[PDB]
Design a protein around this ligand. Structure first.
Ligand SMILES: Nc1ncnc2c1ncn2[C@@H]1O[C@H](COP(=O)(O)OP(=O)(O)OP(=O)(O)O)[C@@H](O)[C@H]1O
Ligand SMILES: Nc1ncnc2c1ncn2[C@@H]1O[C@H](COP(=O)(O)OP(=O)(O)O)[C@@H](O)[C@H]1O
Ligand SMILES: [Mg+2]
Ligand SMILES: [Zn+2]
Ligand SMILES: [Zn+2]
Lengths: 663, 420
C-alpha cells in the first residue's frame, strides 16, 4: 500500500514541552496564563504567540542538561500541525472565568444547553472543539537581534521578494515584502455546519476545511436508523460556525525587478480578527504560511501534477507612514510653539518647498496661498462659495514648472497628478468600472479622481481631448459632476483646487498680442481661473550665471547642498499647513469699502483694456471674488480670527505681479 | 374604521417601558417568531376590542418595526450580526421584475382527473408518490398544473451605501435586498431610503449539475419597513392684491440685482399661454421660448438653475437630447429610450452653452419648435413622440466682449432662421 520511513521527529515530547512552556513560562506571574484568564472572561478574542520567548526559554533551560531537542526548528519546517497542537494545549489548560459574563447573549451556548438538557436527560455527545472556540491563534516572526544573542542561525524573517519564492518553501513560515494592490470585501466562511432533523435528539455536526464540500441528507439517529427517517433534515444557519474571510494579492516592487522583466503577483488569504488590517496602495512586511492549492477548483482535468500556491497571513506590519489627521500631542504642540517663536513663516516656507529649482519666489508664494484655501463655508441664503483657488501656470518649455508641480504633489497629501494622454481611465469613469470578477458593472457615473478636497495637478493643459476638457469645465466652481449613462445619478461632490501647467502652441513667447496667441483655450475657462502667472525665458547674464552655478553645485555634491538655507522641513510644512487650515479665521467687515474701491480701480483698468497689446485686464466679478478669496487665505495662513487690510494689499500686489509678466 | 392593515411600531417608545425591553432584546435575537406572535396577538386584539367580525377574518395583520438600533454601514458587517435586525440607509440603484414565488402546489391525477392541493415548506416539495384515489391507486399518475397554483410576489433591490461612508476616495459597495407584497415597487432608481430588516446568508449552488456547495456564502438582507430619507382660499387672498405681479416676479431671483424686465419675461414664460386643438385648422402652439445672450459676467446660468427647480417638470442640460435606441447594459436586450426634450412635456426645458450645439442636433430643434412632435425611423421602429415643451437658452458672444456696434447675428453664430 504505502511504504513507511523513519523520521527523527516525535510529537509526544513536543506536546509535553509545549504544555510545560505554556504553564511554567516566566517573562504579573506567567504571561500566558495572564492572557488565558482574560480570554476566559470573553475579553480577548484572538491569541498571538511569539517564538522569541520559546527560543530564549529553551536556551536558558538548556543550562540544565535535561532538554534534548528544540522547537523553533520544527516550527519553521512545518506550521499547521503546530497550530493544532497549540489549540489542543490551550483547550486542555483553559482557566476558569474570574469575572461575571453577560451569559444570556451567547445564543450558541443556549442552543448547546437545550441540546444537552434534551439528550443527557435521557442518557450526550462530545462536541468538536472547533465549534466552541472563541479565540483565534496567531504566530509572530522573530527579531534578528534575538538571533544575534545566540550562535545558532534561528533567522527566518529576511523579507524575500515575490519572485524569490521557489517550490522548496512550501509548508514553511516565510516573510514577503511589496505593495498591496487589491483588497476584496469581507465575507463569511464556514467552519462547522449544523443540521436539524425534525426533533432527532442530537443534531448532526460536521466540519469542512476544503474550499468545497457536500451536504448531508439522512441522519444517523436510531429513530432514523430505522428504515425510514423521522423527519427530513435541513441546514441550520444559526447553530453553524463562521469566520471572517478576505482575499488580497501583492505585487513586487519596481526596485526588486531584474532588468527586462515583468513583475509577478502573489495571493494572500486572511482570516480572523486580522481581517481589514491593510488597505490597497501601501508597503507591508507580511509573515505567513506558504501553502499549496489544488487545481481541481478549475475542473479542467489537466495539470495532473501542477498546482497553484497561496499564502495565509499571520502578522502584518503596516509600515509606510501615518497621516494621523494632525491629531494633537505634546510633541506637535511644542513644535507649533517653536513655529510661533520663529516669527515670520511664509517666506521660509516658500524658500523650503523646492530648493532644487532656483529663483521663482512669487510662484512659491502663490503655492503657499493655494495650500491654505480661500473663503468657504457658504454665506446667508445658502449661496455657494468655495475656498478652492484655481491658478494656471504658463511659460516656455524648459522652465521646470513640471518639476515644481511634482514637488508640490509630493508635499501635499491630496495631490493628484495628470498629464497629456497615456491612458483613458483618468477621467469620466470610476476606477471600479467592470472590475469585479463577476462583472457587476460597479460604477458611480459622473466622477473624477478623488475630486472631493483634492488637488488636481495637470501638465500639458492644451493636450487633452474634448472629453477631459468637458469634465474640467464641469468641475467648475465646486459644481458636482452629474453625467449619466445607464440611469445612474449619484453625482460626485466635486470640490477641488485646480493647478495646471500649459505650454504655448508656438513653444515660445510672442511679440504680437497674447490673448490671440493664448493657449488655445476658451476665454470663459481662462476667466474662471483666479490667478494667471507667466514664466518667460529672458536671455541674460546675471540670471543664467546664478542658475548654472546652482545646478552645477547640485550636481557636484550629489545631494541638496548646504548652499540652501531653509529653517523649516517638509514634515514641518505638512504639520503647519494643517495647523493653519484648522484655525480658520473669519471675515472682517471693514475691508468692504477698501475692496469696493479696489474693484472700482480694476474696472477703471477695464476702461483701458481696449488699448490692447495685452487684453487680460478684463471686467469680471470673478476677479473681485478671487481677490476676496486670496485675502481670506492670507488671513487664514496666520494671525487671529480677523482679516487684515494688509492681506488685501498683499493679494492685490500678488495680482499685479501676476499681470505684469505680460509686458 | 379605516379597513387598512398595517401597524407601525417604534422601538424607543417600546423601550420606554421596563417589562417591554425584555421582549425588545428577545426580538433582536429572534425576529421572525416574535413578529409572527405579535401579529397573531393583533389578530386576537381585533375581537378583544370590537367586543363586525366579517372584515376581520378576511384581512391579515403585520407590523413595521423601525428605529431598533443605530444605522450601520456596509463597511462593518461582522458574521456576529447574522439573523439579527439592523437599520440601514442608502441609495436605491436598480430593481428587477417581480418574481412569482411558489406557495400552493397544484396536482392532478391524470388517469382519474383527481386533483389535490399541497402545501409547501422551505421551498422543497414533498411530492405525492401516489394518487389518493385507491380505486385507481396508481403511483405514476401524478402530474402538476403550472397555471392553477397560487403565487407570491418577490422583488429584489440593489442598494448602495451613502457616499458619507467613504472619506478617502474608495469605492462604495452593494448589498442585495428582498421585499414582499406591500413593499413591492415602493422604491425605484435614484431614491434615498432607510430600511430596517434582518440579515441573512445563503449557500451558493456553484455547479448547477452537481451537489457540491462552495465554502463561502452570499450575504443579503430581508427588510420589513422602509422610509424615505384647502389652501386655495389663501391663494385668492394673495391673488387679490394689486402689486402681486412685481413681488411675484422679484420673488424667484432674490440674489439677482436689477434685471427686472427679463425676470418678468421669464415669469410670464413660466406661466405659459393657452393651448387649443380646434380641428378645422389643427392645433396651435401655446409655449413661449426665450433666448439669453451676453458676456459671461452676468451669472446667467444661475437663472436657469433657479427655474429648473422652481418649475414642476423640466430637464436642465447643455450642448443626445432626444430619443435614441440603446443596448441594455446589465441585461442583453433592446429598449426604446427617450431624450431630455421628450420628458419636458408641459414644462420648461433649459439649455446652456447653446453656441456649442454641434450641427446634427440643431436640425432636431428646428423639427421640434415648428411642430412640437418628433418622429424616429430606426431599427425597424417608426413612430412619433410628442414634446410640447418650452425652451429657454443662453449663449455667449465670440471674443472677450460683445461689441455694441457689431450686430447681434455674427457674435451669436446661430443661423438666422433659428434665431428668428
Ligand atoms: N530654475 C531652475 N532650476 C533648476 N533646474 C532648472 C530650472 N529651470 C529648469 N531646470 C531644469 O530643466 C529641467 C526641467 O524642465 P522641463 O522642460 O522638464 O519642464 P517644463 O518647463 O514643465 O517643460 P516640459 O513640458 O518640456 O517638461 C530639469 O532638468 C531642471 O534641472
Ligand atoms: N449680477 C450678479 N450677481 C451675482 N453674481 C454675479 C453677477 N454677475 C456675475 N456674477 C458672478 O460671475 C459669474 C458669471 O458667470 P456666467 O455669466 O453665468 O458664466 P456662463 O454663463 O458663461 O457660465 C457667476 O458665477 C457669478 O458668480
Ligand atoms: Mg513641462
Ligand atoms: Zn429526522
Ligand atoms: Zn387517482
Amino acid at each position: 500500500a504505502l511504504p513507511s520511513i523513519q523520521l527523527p521527529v516525535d510529537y509526544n515530547n513536543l506536546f509535553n514541552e509545549i504544555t510545560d512552556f505554556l504553564v511554567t513560562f516566566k517573562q504579573k506571574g506567567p504571561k500566558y496564563m495572564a492572557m488565558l484568564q482574560k480570554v476566559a472572561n470573553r475579553e480577548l478574542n484572538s491569541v498571538i504567540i511569539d517564538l522569541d520567548d520559546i527560543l530564549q526559554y529553551q536556551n536558558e533551560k538548556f543550562l540544565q542538561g535535561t532538554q534534548a531537542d528544540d522547537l523553533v526548528s520544527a516550527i519553521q519546517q512545518n506550521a499547521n500541525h503546530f497550530t493544532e497542537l497549540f489549540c489542543r494545549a490551550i483547550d486542555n489548560n483553559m482557566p476558569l472565568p474570574t469575572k461575571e459574563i453577560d451569559y444570556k447573549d451567547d445564543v450558541l451556548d443556549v442552543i448547546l444547553n437545550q441540546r444537552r438538557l434534551r439528550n443527557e436527560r435521557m442518557l450526550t455527545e462530545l462536541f468538536p472543539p472547533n465549534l466552541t472556540r472563541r479565540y483565534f491563534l496567531y504566530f509572530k516572526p522573530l527579531s534578528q537581534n534575538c538571533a544575534r544573542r545566540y550562535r545558532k542561525k534561528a533567522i527566518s524573517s529576511k523579507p524575500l521578494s515575490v519572485r524569490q519564492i521557489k517550490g522548496d518553501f512550501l509548508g514553511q513560515l516565510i516573510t514577503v515584502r511589496g505593495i498591496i494592490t487589491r483588497v476584496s470585501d469581507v465575507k463569511p466562511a464556514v467552519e462547522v455546519i449544523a443540521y436539524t432533523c425534525d426533533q432527532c435528539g442530537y443534531e448532526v455536526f460536521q466540519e469542512v476545511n476544503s474550499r468545497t464540500f457536500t451536504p448531508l441528507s439522512e441522519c444517523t439517529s436510531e429513530e432514523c436508523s430505522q428504515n425510514q427517517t423521522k423527519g427530513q433534515l435541513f441546514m441550520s444557519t444559526r447553530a453553524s460556525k463562521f469566520s471572517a474571510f478576505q482575499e488580497c494579492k501583492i505585487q513586487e516592487l519596481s526596485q526588486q525587478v531584474p532588468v527586462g522583466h515583468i513583475p509577478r503577483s502573489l495571493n494572500i488569504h486572511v482570516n480572523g480578527t486580522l481581517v481589514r488590517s491593510l488597505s490597497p496602495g501601501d508597503i507591508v512586511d507580511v509573515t505567513g504560511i506558504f501553502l499549496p492549492a489544488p487545481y481541481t477548483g478549475f475542473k479542467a482535468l489537466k495539470a495532473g501534477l501542477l498546482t497553484e500556491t497561496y499564502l495565509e497571513a499571520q502578522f502584518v506590519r503596516q509600515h509606510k507612514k501615518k497621516f494621523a489627521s494632525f491629531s494633537l500631542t505634546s510633541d506637535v504642540e511644542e513644535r507649533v510653539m517653536e513655529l510661533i517663536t520663529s516669527g515670520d513663516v511664509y517666506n521660509r516656507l516658500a524658500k523650503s518647498i523646492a530648493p532644487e529649482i532656483y529663483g521663482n519666489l512669487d510662484v512659491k508664494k502663490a503655492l503657499l496661498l493655494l495650500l491654505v484655501g480661500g473663503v468657504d463655508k457658504r454665506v446667508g441664503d445658502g449661496m455657494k462659495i468655495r475656498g478652492d483657488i484655481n491658478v494656471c501656470l504658463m511659460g516656455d518649455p524648459g522652465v521646470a514648472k513640471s518639476q515644481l508641480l511634482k514637488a508640490i504633489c509630493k508635499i501635499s497629501p491630496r495631490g493628484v497628478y495628470t498629464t497629456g494622454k497615456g491612458s483613458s481611465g483618468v477621467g469620466l469613469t470610476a476606477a471600479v468600472m467592470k472590475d469585479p470578477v463577476t462583472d457587476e458593472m460597479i460604477l458611480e457615473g459622473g466622477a473624477l479622481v478623488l475630486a472631493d478636497n483634492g488637488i488636481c495637478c495637470i501638465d500639458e493643459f492644451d493636450k487633452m481631448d474634448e472629453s477631459d476638457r468637458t469634465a474640467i469645465h464641469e468641475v467648475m466652481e465646486q459644481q458636482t459632476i452629474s453625467i449619466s449613462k445607464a440611469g445612474i445619478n449619484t453625482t460626485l461632490n466635486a470640490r477641488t483646487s485646480i493647478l495646471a501647467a500649459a505650454n504655448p502652441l508656438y513653444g515660445r513667447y510672442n511679440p504680437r498680442l497674447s490673448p490671440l496667441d493664448n493657449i488655445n483655450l476658451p476665454a470663459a475657462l481662462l476667466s474662471r481661473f483666479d490667478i494667471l502667472f507667466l514664466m518667460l525665458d529672458i536671455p541674460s547674464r546675471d540670471d543664467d550665471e546664478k542658475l548654472a552655478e546652482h545646478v552645477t553645485y547640485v550636481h557636484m555634491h550629489n545631494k541638496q547642498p548646504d548652499l540652501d538655507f531653509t529653517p523649516v522641513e517638509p514634515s514641518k510644512m505638512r504639520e503647519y499647513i494643517a495647523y493653519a487650515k484648522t484655525k480658520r479665521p473669519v471675515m472682517s467687515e471693514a475691508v468692504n469699502d477698501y475692496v469696493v474701491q479696489a474693484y472700482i480701480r480694476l474696472r477703471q483698468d477695464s476702461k483701458r483694456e481696449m488699448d490692447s497689446k495685452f487684453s487680460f485686464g478684463q471686467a469680471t466679478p470673478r476677479t473681485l471674488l478671487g481677490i476676496i478669496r486670496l485675502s481670506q487665505a492670507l488671513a487664514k495662513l496666520r494671525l487671529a480670527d480677523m482679516v487684515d487690510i494688509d492681506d488685501v494689499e498683499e493679494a492685490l500686489r500678488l495680482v499685479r505681479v501676476s499681470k505684469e509678466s505680460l509686458y | 374604521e379605516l379597513g387598512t392593515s398595517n401597524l407601525n411600531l417604534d422601538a424607543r417608545n417600546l423601550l420606554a417601558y421596563k417589562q417591554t425591553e425584555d421582549l425588545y432584546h428577545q426580538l433582536l435575537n429572534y425576529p421572525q417568531e416574535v413578529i409572527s406572535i405579535m401579529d397573531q396577538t393583533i389578530k386576537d386584539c381585533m375581537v378583544s376590542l370590537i367586543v363586525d367580525l366579517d372584515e376581520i377574518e378576511t384581512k391579515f395583520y403585520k407590523v413595521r418595526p423601525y428605529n431598533v438600533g443605530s444605522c450601520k454601514g456596509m463597511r462593518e458587517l461582522n458574521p456576529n450580526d447574522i439573523d439579527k435586525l439592523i437599520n440601514l440607509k442608502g441609495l436605491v440603484l436598480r430593481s428587477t421584475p417581480v418574481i412569482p414565488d411558489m406557495k400552493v402546489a397544484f396536482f392532478k391525477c391524470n388517469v382519474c382527473d383527481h386533483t389535490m392541493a399541497v402545501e409547501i415548506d422551505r421551498g422543497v416539495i414533498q411530492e405525492p408518490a401516489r394518487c389518493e384515489r385507491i380505486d385507481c391507486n396508481e403511483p405514476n399518475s401524478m402530474s402538476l398544473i403550472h397555471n392553477r397554483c397560487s403565487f407570491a410576489d418577490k422583488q429584489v433591490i440593489k442598494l448602495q451605501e451613502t457616499p458619507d461612508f467613504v472619506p478617502d476616495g474608495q469605492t462604495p459597495h452593494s448589498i442585495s435586498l428582498c421585499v414582499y407584497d406591500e413593499l413591492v415597487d415602493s422604491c425605484r432608481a435614484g431614491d434615498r431610503i432607510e430600511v430596517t430588516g434582518t440579515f441573512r446568508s445563503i449557500p451558493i449552488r456553484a455547479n448547477s449539475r452537481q451537489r457540491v456547495l462552495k465554502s463561502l456564502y452570499k450575504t443579503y438582507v430581508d427588510v420589513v419597513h422602509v422610509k424615505k430619507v384647502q389652501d386655495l382660499a389663501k391663494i385668492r387672498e394673495v391673488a387679490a392684491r394689486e402689486d402681486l405681479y412685481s413681488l411675484l416676479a422679484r420673488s424667484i431671483a432674490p440674489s439677482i440685482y436689477e434685471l427686472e424686465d427679463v425676470k418678468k419675461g421669464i415669469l410670464l414664460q413660466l406661466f405659459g399661454g393657452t393651448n387649443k386643438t380646434f380641428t378645422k385648422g389643427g392645433r396651435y402652439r401655446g409655449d413661449i421660448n426665450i433666448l439669453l445672450c451676453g458676456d459671461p459676467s452676468t451669472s446667467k446660468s444661475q437663472i436657469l438653475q433657479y427655474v429648473h427647480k422652481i418649475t414642476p417638470r423640466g430637464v436642465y442640460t447643455s450642448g443626445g437630447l432626444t430619443a435614441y435606441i440603446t443596448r441594455d447594459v446589465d441585461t442583453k436586450q433592446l429598449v426604446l429610450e427617450s431624450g431630455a426634450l421628450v420628458l419636458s412635456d408641459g414644462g420648461v426645458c433649459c439649455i446652456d452653452e447653446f453656441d456649442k450645439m454641434s450641427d446634427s442636433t440643431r436640425s432636431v430643434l428646428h423639427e421640434v419648435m415648428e411642430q412640437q412632435t418628433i418622429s424616429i425611423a430606426k431599427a425597424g421602429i417608426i413612430t412619433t413622440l410628442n414634446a410640447r415643451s418650452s425652451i429657454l437658452a443662453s449663449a455667449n458672444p465670440i471674443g472677450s466682449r460683445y461689441n455694441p456696434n457689431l450686430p447681434v447675428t455674427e457674435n451669436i453664430d446661430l443661423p438666422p432662421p433659428l434665431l428668428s
